[PDB]
A = this chain, B = another copy of it.
Amino acid sequence: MKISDGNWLIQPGLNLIHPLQVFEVEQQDNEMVVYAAPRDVRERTWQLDTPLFTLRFFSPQEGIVGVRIEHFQGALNNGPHYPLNILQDVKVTIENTERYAEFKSGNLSARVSKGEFWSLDFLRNGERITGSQVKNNGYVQDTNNQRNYMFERLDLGVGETVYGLGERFTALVRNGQTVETWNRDGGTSTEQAYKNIPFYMTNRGYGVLVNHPQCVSFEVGSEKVSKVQFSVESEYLEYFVIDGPTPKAVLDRYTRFTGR
């Protein structure tokens, strides 16, 4: 789903807001909540007449970090939900310092930078395997059709190739392709797939599950060439980063999480 129009502009009729500044961090047992403003809210005068994102970091399994980014909590949100194996007591570490809010499960953490330069990073023993740069996630208000979406873009590094997203018949490596995760009867000869799964993995040894059984619209280095973009029509976005650090070890965690 096209959101930007090149580097400089945005698709006509789209109003974007982004999480840009940590306003508050709150540890809720073994989950970390980050409240994040779409503008500078350091002064009281700006602490009103603004949207606000609520981000929740949690861990359903060792070495999987779940990220929920949320706009309005008042929407309906009915099932079904994916058949996920979720533990309530995975051992995690939460570090809330002046500079960072870091949530860690096994060797994998999510870290949000406080202050002027927002950053969301996923680290494997303190080395960055991917992340979301400022303004690369948030809420899309589509003024043409009155629809609203949440979206993320996770970085791709040099030489990083993307695989999966179900049983597809286009080129094996996904970089360059758009994919809609929506089951169709289209044979084996087109971009359509009978068997869609909103999970991908890379040759950098992590994987990601976008936690949304509706259509998820993936722009796999097809909109921003060095990022995997996903968007979904929803008041919240939830996705899981799944550590490896090999493809086999990602699949091990992914099938522990979703079914053997």
Contacts and interface: CB of A to CB of B under 8 A. Distances in A.
A185 B6 CA distance: 7
A141 to B, nearest CB: 13
B7 A187 contact: yes
Interface string A1-40: 0001111100000000000000000000000000000000
B177 A6 contact: no
A202 interface: no
A35 to B, nearest CB: 24
A134 B226 CA distance: 38
A119 interface: no
A222 B170 contact: yes
Interface string A125-165: 00000000000000000000000000000000000000000
Contacts of A223: 190-191
A4 to B, nearest CB: 7
A152 to B, nearest CB: 17
A43 B191 CA distance: 31
Nearest to A188: B7
Contact of A190 (B174, B186, B225): B225
B186 A5 contact: yes
Indicate the size class of the contact surface on chain A: 20 to 34
Most buried by B among A174, A176, A187, A226: A176
Contacts of A8: 185-187
A17 to B, nearest CB: 17
A59 interface: no
A175 B170 contact: yes
A50 interface: no
A169 interface: yes
Given A176-B176, A177-B177, A226-B189, A170 B6 contact: no
Contacts of A177: 176-177, 222
Q: Which 10 A-B pairs have the closest CB atoms?
A: A6-B186, A7-B187, A171-B176, A176-B177, A171-B175, A170-B176, A6-B192, A176-B176, A6-B190, A169-B225
